[PDB]
């Protein structure tokens, strides 16, 4: 696709042409609030007599479902100060930089981190540095330490004797998690090891079981041929703990402060949803939803899946 085609010949380095070595980078951590880790370059790259310096924003992740947000000021967003700013990769965040041998080269982020969520838009604009900001959400599980980079380089912008700075983002993901409570309805090996239950193609009504507790993450890799699903906007509670308002049907309605990731199932690559039960929620709740498939190619028999979600069933 044009959103993520990689140029295999592209080459660069962390320092670029600044001649600065890493021991002289101005290194600092991302500003982290809740589960959003933000690198904001809006005021870090303006030209100064001392320029160009290297501003390295370090994003260190060893927890699940962290959203990474990177803001790079736009050319002409302020007169003169960013006339020659460049960002790399141009197709961030779908394409990132990783170190191969000793240089930075382009890599598909979704191939690097299975289950990673790239939404098409940010603030109702394209998720691309051309609009000033990119975002992505790391998955509930990462098996291998992973390091990749973004460049927001204002070092070629000149204003009087002053030069802008070269901004680097280093995202350093340490391994975290093991397996998502839930089911994968079945490169392929990545799919088979990511969820606790693998539902291989069946021609009947078959049950997936997602057992969760306070603080747990669950998720589902939905079938390829999905037509319709009530997971998780139209849940049906069973077992009679409390009285049920039939309009309080989403997991949000039923579990205060629960979060569903990729509700719109509009993230690229991965036909997944993740759910997070908050640590505050201590009540017991058994829920049900369903997945219906398209009969595009008939097997003479229709496929459907029942998804059972039990919360705090202890």
């Amino acid at each position, epitope marked *: 696709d044009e959103l993520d085609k990689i140029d295999l010949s592209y080459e660069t*380095t962390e*320092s670029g042409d600044t*001649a600065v*070595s890493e*021991d002289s980078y101005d290194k600092y951590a991302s500003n982290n609030t809740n589960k959003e880790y933000v690198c904001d370059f809006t005021d870090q790259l303006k030209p100064t007599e001392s320029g160009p310096k290297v501003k390295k924003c370090e994003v260190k992740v060893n927890e699940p479902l962290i959203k990474v947000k990177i803001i790079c000021p736009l050319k002409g967003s302020v007169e003169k100060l960013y006339d020659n700013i460049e960002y790399v990769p141009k197709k961030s965040p779908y394409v990132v930089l990783t*170190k191969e041998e*000793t240089k930075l080269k382009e890599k598909l982020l979704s191939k690097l981190i299975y289950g990673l969520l790239i939404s098409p838009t940010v603030n109702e604009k394209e998720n691309n540095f051309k609009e000033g900001v990119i975002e992505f959400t790391l998955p509930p599980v990462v098996h291998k*330490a992973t390091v990749f980079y973004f460049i927001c380089d204002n070092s070629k912008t000149e204003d009087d004797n002053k030069k802008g700075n070269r901004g680097i983002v280093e995202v*350093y993901v340490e391994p975290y998690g093991n397996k998502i409570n839930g089911c994968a309805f079945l490169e392929k090996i990545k799919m088979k090891t990511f969820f606790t239950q693998n539902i291989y193609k069946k021609n009947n009504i078959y049950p997936c079981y997602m057992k969760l507790y306070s603080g747990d993450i669950g998720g589902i890799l939905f079938p390829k041929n999905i037509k319709s699903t009530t997971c998780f906007e139209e849940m049906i509670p069973y077992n009679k703990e409390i009285k049920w308002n039939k309009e309080n049907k989403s997991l949000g309605n039923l579990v205060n402060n629960s979060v569903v990731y990729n509700k719109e199932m509009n993230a690229k690559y991965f036909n997944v949803q993740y759910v997070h039960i908050p640590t505050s929620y201590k009540d017991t709740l058994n829920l049900f939803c369903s997945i219906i498939l398209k009969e595009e190619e008939s097997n003479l028999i229709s496929t459907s899946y029942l998804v059972y979600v039990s919360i705090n069933e202890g």
Partner: single-chain antibody, 229 residues
Framework: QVQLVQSGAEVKKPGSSVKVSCKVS????????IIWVRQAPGQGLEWMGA????????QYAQKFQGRVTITADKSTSTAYMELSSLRSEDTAVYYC???????????WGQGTLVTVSSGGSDIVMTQSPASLALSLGERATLYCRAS??????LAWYQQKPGKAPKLLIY???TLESGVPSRFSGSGSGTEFTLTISSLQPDDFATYYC?????????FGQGTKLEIKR
């Protein structure tokens, strides 16, 4: 600043193994490549392999495949190189080095002497002249040719006897910090030059060019620049 300190000299019997350590202090360890280079006495520099510590796996020159293991201990910022089935020809000074965001190996250990006592499509670097005899204050011009196009991914190193290589120029023409301006580099593609505008006593040494376009990194056999008799 950044220091690489290696373990001390070793004497081994033929057929044995040796493990050399390289402790990095004052620089970031986990995300920058550590390389290992050896130099047989009186001979040139030879790339053996590299590791980016967070990856938990090294890369090796085919010449050493199956005899060399490169590892890194992140909690101590120490890299290791283990060479097995030692033979006489493995007698050499082994160097560790690291890159610092500019692709080139710009920080070097002091070297470890190891004494043994009882491929196709690689880029070939050709230096000339093999020897230069010049007087103080004269200009020196050194040449380096690559068998394949390497754009400007070429470095120049100065080595004094017994000492580790010292980076002078990287990206063909960029001076390393602290290097006097009488050193200059030129060229791109396959032909490169190092010029010393006016020779001073400190400038007499062996100079090596090195392509760092692609592994295995390869060195020219050096130009020995000595005082005119």
């Amino acid at each position: 600043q950044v220091q690489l300190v290696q373990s001390g000299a070793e004497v081994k019997k033929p057929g044995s193994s040796v493990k050399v350590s390289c402790k990095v202090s004052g620089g970031t360890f986990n995300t920058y490549a550590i390389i290992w280079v050896r130099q047989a006495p009186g001979q040139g520099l030879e790339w053996m392999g590299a590791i980016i510590p967070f990856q938990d796996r090294g890369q090796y020159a085919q010449k050493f495949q199956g005899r060399v293991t490169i590892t890194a201990d992140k909690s101590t910022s120490t890299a290791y190189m283990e060479l097995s089935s030692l033979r006489s020809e493995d007698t050499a000074v082994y160097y560790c080095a690291k890159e610092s965001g500019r692709a080139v190996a710009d920080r070097w250990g002091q070297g470890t002497l190891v004494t043994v006592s009882s491929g196709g499509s690689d880029i070939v670097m050709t230096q000339s002249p093999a020897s230069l005899a010049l007087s103080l204050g004269e200009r020196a011009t050194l040449y380096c040719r690559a068998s394949h196009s390497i754009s400007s991914w070429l470095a120049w190193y100065q080595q004094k006897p017994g000492k580790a290589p010292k980076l002078l120029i990287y990206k063909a023409s960029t001076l390393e910090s602290g290097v006097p301006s009488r050193f200059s580099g030129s060229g791109s593609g396959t032909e490169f030059t190092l010029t010393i505008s006016s020779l001073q006593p400190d400038d007499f040494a062996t100079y090596y060019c090195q392509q760092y376009k692609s592994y295995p990194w390869t060195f020219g056999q050096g130009t020995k620049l000595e005082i005119k008799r």
